[PDB]
Design a protein around this ligand. Structure first.
Ligand SMILES: O=c1c2ccccc2[nH]c2ccc(Nc3ccn([C@@H]4O[C@H](CO)[C@@H](O)[C@H](O)[C@H]4O)c(=O)n3)cc12
Ligand SMILES: O=c1c2ccccc2[nH]c2ccc(Nc3ccn([C@@H]4O[C@H](CO)[C@@H](O)[C@H](O)[C@H]4O)c(=O)n3)cc12
Ligand SMILES: *Cc1c(COP(=O)(O)O)cnc(C)c1O
Ligand SMILES: *Cc1c(COP(=O)(O)O)cnc(C)c1O
Lengths: 807, 807
């Protein structure tokens, strides 16, 4: 149908049809008379999977022969979403499969909707890991993603009476055709026990054993015949009254049962610590085994890079030391040299509630040898600090890995900095904040360690896959090379005054909006005006992300309409979606507020279809792929200094939405790339937030000086949005007035005024679309291919490649 | 190689080789450089599996079109063993696969040894179910086996210091290629709750739901292209703090976690009751669904037969009543008529400790509606008894389904008799005992219900598969038709004086013994004399089976050798194997005694290799297939009246062993078929045991009158077989002397004298072999094809068929 989706060769279509029929018969054990759409989905998945395996075996054989430096990306989350379409895109099979299925009387898009998301992550951190795997494969790096195979991923969100309810995500119920169990490579992981000392050295004895069984999933590069591996560990009990002993195997196996549904927030639970050590211990054995199949660990850092995605896999540092010192019998200083040169750490947030600090008593019980190693690391590190800054005793307590107080804790971020040769933030402003604030002492000791690697997104999933219409009209003008070289989008600046291109860009957006408007009616029985401005904020529900600021604007627009019903206003559909962590009370109340505002606004006859407020249920990767291409306005409105980077922001920019945002995270670099004149920037800068913190933030001042703001707070307090329960939102009002860490009121006036400028521009479709073109054309920097190239050259010491392996 | 293993056609061998290579590459994702024997096993299994699916789909389609009466065999156990070789035998693929694998440089017998037993049973009852499935498919019956997919089957037995240790049987660790998950046919099962009454009728509300997910396994008939289904249910929690709620899903899913390892013994545990209802509830929904796809339940018994394997699935009776009355709104009398005509019950034992009696309070809590239905069944049944036997009040209490006492219980056997149109025992003597003793009252009320169906074994697994050498020399004389018509073995009586046949029979046994003797050294590092008489007792460890009587004989032989070292005695290898239930103390002590006797006997220089005593570890179906073909003497020595049938006895007879046995269970019919002169019969008959019980069994009398018996008891008591722990066997001695329910001493003298006659005959190889031929030749009656033909005609009302379906 469209050129970017590849060729539908006569022979290939014939071969796909017969293999489809083979799988339906032999693999699924069905005939066409009793087959359901789900059976047809699986037949297609197995057919496409077959095209991966030759390349997969060949890739891994190639790495064994050439023995390049291996990159190990350790993460507790890989937010992969669906795999079928992504695989077809990367193998150039999409049109052929479309034709083959069409000839069998099937609609391939219908079959794609049957696949469950692999929701093994919460949000940004987990999705970054997924984008990174795609880019590492596309750039020909010998890269392995290592994590946990959670039996239950992020919960499915239901909205009942306006409230979030959680349901278990039983994503493996119908099977996962993409994974391959590898029980033969199962490895032991140790917990508890005690340390005894001998003439030889320390020994960790009397431990409990849990087995780590790997499942391997292929990760195809973009049309280069490279297929890398994501290896996810599953917990199994070893085989050694009788009935209760067998039933109690669940205790061990619970380690891999469920993803903790926290986003940018730390809770010190023992099961989570077990998960963290589980992935680390199994992974490091696998790394060392692969290295030994190449005595001398001097070459270990030349053959191995370990990238720590946040502090969650930080135990890699003392585990590597444990293995090298206790088992391989290396002296401490040599082991430490190897460890530091091997490990690198990426920080993803400065929010203090998100930093991992584990109680010592927990480590003492669970991992007694690792605690000893951490203490030794700390003593040697602080001796260096003392030599560099003599007499600076406060610095010593500030930099210590051990935090004193009622309960002694280990600061895992401090451990990571000490044991890594490179530490990076994820956007320029964030990396600067790290050096100026929370890691200032460490930067002063070891400035060379500190880097920036601005985040990015894969243009395969986030353009070609989710927005083929846009990818096609771009390809028509500048060819297909931009899909693996996104900087080529700069060529589109030559078409900003091209009347044909302006029309095509606008047409693609309108079609996307019509498609999404239809999807809403089908699945959720809700009607919207497709000519309205689609105003979208999708991301996890958090105070720092300020969904509440969006809510205040929505109520402002509603009140203004009620005040002057017969004045024209630009019609809007305001969509807000995202999950709240189950224990996060305030986040759950914010969801209830949004639906409550919808209940009033959507049923007021005077409003008509000029304003609609919809809460998008169960926001997840598959839904992002639908809503982002349909968006006109991207809401990126975190308090300056709180969103380390953001990546949803980049997805919207690539898909033809304009951005309203604070100068926070990667928004700063996006505005710099596109030009501030082509961005809707408002609000306090980081420096303004600091100044306000110094004199003290008084929300009452804004309430007293802004009548429109006062009206809204009175409406909330009085029960306007909750008639049968007038004090329902008292906690929200109380927070805003007296305990708002994120200064919602301080940015309200500028936000509302900025939103008026958005509406003004939307009234002129041609100039709106020209500004969109300027955004799309300068989105190239935000390819994760660029990000990974920088990690490769500046941290891992390996060169990327776009050369194809032989099929 | 040999004709019974089928043809190795050039095209078939070529096609198997390419499909093998396809599976290794695409299915297993391996190349030949890194493949292990296990990978090669799986490649072969998938290749053979592919040949089943066409026949499997075609068979089930055939049943849908012709709509024959369906037979539902409900069992809590299916002791299937390995599937690969059985499948090859039944599809005539064995030689072709042998050739194909040979050409790829692989030994197929080596690959067969990698497959795990599907050990979803304990012993005789579970293995009977497996044999029955094979025969039902071979006879072209539209038959379905329904059970539970236990995650852990019967434990693996290790012997440590002479003591049994249990290890979990993680049989699904590497995957099960034979099963097909059918998540789309998942069904709900209800527990707990309460009953409320309305104008309409009773309703069972406020229940907890567990999902039953089916897995289907093919069951091929012998070379008739029929492939039936065994459907096993797996327990799943429905999808509706957060973390603990997800972790607590294990509570529901524990229903299908583990097989209770009890053999011929009842324990009233709640989890077991949940297992029993789980299989029943899911199965009956599946039955009714299939029936409705053919309002009118008058025809239900014409289209459905439900066979209850023991009382374990007895809840089918009140569940069927519940569905018909509460959900389908049939009147009670009509529902009862349908239920009785649909259900039939097989009793497998008269031992009182094996009879299922569930406490009322347990049923009241778990299954409150079923308890109500059971009470109503009981009231109506006892009203019939009262009308038939007026004034006989003791009969009323004897026949009641409800047993009074400290704790009220439901007698599930009584429920089964009341709600079934046919009740059968499993051997003639057993069926007679049922009518004369435990079910006498029921026989007097409804004599027409009571039948016999003597057990049998499948000659596919238990001759062709495990003893191809014997199958081949038979086929050479009488052709191959006997494999599905075992009565044709009677033709071998014409060869009892044939010198060539005598030599061949003897040669096959010697080769089997050499092969087994080698297997013992390889796997268990134990040496044996292959020219000795192989004296074998393999079966679960039980007091009623009298492994202890065997032990007494072994010690007698040892003592006689020590008394006259230089006298010639026929050399013996005495092998005893079997598992003990983990809680069965006395059974565990018996195992310890056997190994303790071995420790003394096997290391006494004066004995030499004239007597060896070996405990065969981890007795299971795969080991039975090895040891039975190697046996000379089959020990079937249960106290008369205790072994309902036995089936191991039949396996030995078919494979060229002579039998030493009591007139118990099917031994009676085996001796009748072969002639008593060709059987080593000894000991009390049932009538003798009764007479002894009337005057009272005094073991002291035998001790006082038999000096050789006295010596052994003194040796046991004094610590002869346990020097460092002299009173180790005090419990065994105490039991034998004062509390022996099974009269070990009463049969000792006759047993020893009978064993002397065995030794005498073994000294004359020609006459031994002629007697063997007379046994093999008259084993035809004990084919499970004969058994199933009788169930079909006399209980289910369906005609068997040997006509082949088109491939
Ligand atoms: O501390 C925990 C935790 C503790 C116990 C159990 C489960 C847990 N799960 C977590 C999941 C995530 C996080 N932390 C973060 C930190 C940053 N981010 C986001 O990362 C993106 C990629 O760099 C950025 O674009 C974004 O700005 C940032 O917020 C992000 O998305 N989650 C922290 C935790
Ligand atoms: O009562 C239980 C039970 C209770 C709680 C949990 C698990 C349980 N498992 C059981 C497993 C088996 C049995 N009962 C029997 C009864 C007879 N048999 C044997 O059946 C063979 C086939 O007919 C006969 O050849 C043999 O003579 C007989 O002993 C045989 O092999 N098991 C009873 C139970
Ligand atoms: C990109 C993405 C995120 C991250 O969005 P931010 O706005 O950067 O927080 C979260 N969830 C999903 C499903 C995504 O695709
Ligand atoms: C046949 C068989 C049994 C039953 O043997 P009996 O001697 O009849 O109790 C038990 N276990 C296994 C593994 C069998 O093959």
């Amino acid at each position: 149908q469209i050129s970017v989706r590849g060729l539908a060769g006569v022979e290939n279509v014939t071969e796909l049809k017969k293999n489809f029929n083979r799988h339906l018969h032999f693999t699924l054990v069905k005939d066409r008379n009793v087959a359901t759409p789900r059976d047809y989905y699986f037949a297609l998945a197995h057919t496409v999977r077959d095209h991966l395996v030759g390349r997969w075996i060949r890739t891994q054989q190639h790495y064994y022969e050439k023995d390049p430096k291996r990159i190990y990306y350790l993460s507790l989350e890989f937010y992969m979403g669906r795999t079928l379409q992504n695989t077809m895109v990367n193998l150039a099979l999409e049109n052929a499969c479309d034709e083959a299925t069409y000839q069998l009387g099937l609609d391939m898009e219908e079959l794609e909707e049957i696949e469950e998301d692999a929701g093994l992550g919460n949000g940004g951190l987990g999705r970054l890991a997924a984008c990174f795997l795609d880019s590492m494969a596309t750039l020909g790096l010998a890269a392995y993603g290592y994590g946990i195979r959670y039996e239950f991923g992020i919960f499915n969100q239901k909205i009942c009476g306006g409230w979030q309810m959680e349901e278990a995500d039983d994503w493996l119920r119908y099977g996962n055709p993409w994974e391959k169990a590898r029980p033969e490579f199962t490895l032991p992981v140790h917990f508890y026990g005690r340390v005894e000392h001998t003439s030889q050295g320390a020994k960790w004895v009397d431990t409990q054993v849990v087995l780590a069984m790997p499942y391997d999933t292929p990760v195809p590069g973009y049309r280069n015949n490279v297929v890398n591996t994501m290896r996810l560990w599953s917990a199994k009990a070893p085989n050694d009254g009788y009935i209760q002993a067998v039933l109690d195997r669940n205790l061990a196996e619970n380690i891999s049962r469920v993803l903790y549904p926290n986003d940018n927030f730390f809770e010190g639970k023992e099961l989570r610590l077990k998960q963290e050590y589980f992935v680390v211990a199994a992974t490091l054995q696998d790394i060392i085994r692969r290295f030994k199949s190449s005595t001398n660990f001097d070459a270990f850092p030349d053959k191995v890079a370990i990238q720590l995605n946040d502090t969650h896999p930080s135990l890699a540092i003392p585990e590597l030391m444990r293995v090298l010192v206790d088992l391989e019998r290396l002296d401490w200083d040599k082991a430490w040299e190897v460890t530091v040169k091997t490990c690198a750490y990426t920080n993803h947030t400065v929010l203090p509630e998100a930093l991992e600090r584990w109680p010592v008593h927990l480590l003492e019980t669970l991992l007694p040898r690792h605690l000893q190693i951490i203490y030794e690391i700390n003593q040697r590190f602080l001796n260096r600090v003392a030599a560099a800054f003599p007499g600076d005793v406060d610095r010593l307590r500030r930099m210590s890995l051990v935090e004193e107080g009622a309960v002694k804790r280990i600061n895992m971020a401090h451990l990571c900095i000490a044991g890594s040769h490179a530490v990076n933030g994820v956007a320029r402003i964030h990396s600067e904040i790290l050096k100026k604030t929370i890691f200032k002492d460490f930067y002063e000791l070891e400035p060379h360690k500190f880097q920036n690697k601005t985040n990015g997104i894969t243009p395969r999933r986030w353009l070609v896959l989710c927005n083929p219409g846009l990818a096609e009209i771009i390809a028509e003008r500048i060819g297909e090379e931009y899909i693996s070289d996104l900087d080529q989008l700069r060529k589109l600046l030559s078409y900003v005054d091209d009347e044909a291109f302006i029309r095509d860009v606008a047409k693609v957006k309108q079609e996307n909006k019509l498609k999404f408007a239809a999807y809403l009616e089908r699945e959720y029985k809700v009607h919207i005006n497709p000519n309205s401005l689609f105003d979208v904020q999708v991301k996890r529900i958090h105070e720092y992300k300020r969904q509440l600021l969006n809510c205040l604007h929505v109520i402002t627009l509603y009140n203004r309409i009620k005040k002057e019903p017969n004045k024209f206003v630009v019609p809007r559909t305001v969509m807000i979606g995202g999950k709240a962590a189950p224990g996060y009370h305030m986040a759950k109340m914010i969801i209830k507020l949004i639906t409550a505002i919808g209940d009033v606004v959507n049923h007021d006859p005077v409003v008509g279809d000029r304003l609609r407020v919809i809460f998008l249920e169960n926001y997840r990767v598959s839904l992002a792929e639908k809503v982002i291409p349909a968006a006109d306005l991207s809401e990126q409105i975190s308090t300056a200094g709180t969103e380390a980077s953001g990546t949803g922001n980049m997805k919207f920019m690539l898909n033809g939405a304009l951005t309203i945002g604070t100068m926070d995270g990667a928004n700063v670099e996006m505005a710099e790339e596109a030009g501030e004149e082509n961005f809707f920037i408002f609000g306090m800068r980081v420096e303004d937030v600091d100044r306000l913190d110094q004199r003290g933030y008084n929300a009452q001042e804004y309430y007293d000086r802004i009548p429109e703001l006062r009206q809204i707070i009175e409406q909330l307090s009085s029960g306007f949005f909750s008639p049968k329960q007038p004090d329902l939102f008292k906690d929200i009002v109380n927070m805003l007035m007296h305990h708002d860490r994120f200064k919602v009121f301080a940015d309200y006036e500028e936000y509302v005024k900025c939103q008026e400028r958005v509406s003004a521009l939307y009234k002129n479709p041609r100039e709106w679309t020209r500004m969109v073109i300027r955004n799309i054309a300068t989105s190239g920097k935000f390819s994760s291919d660029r990000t990974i190239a920088q990690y490769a050259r500046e941290i891992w010491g390996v060169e990327p490649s776009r050369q194809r392996l032989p099929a």
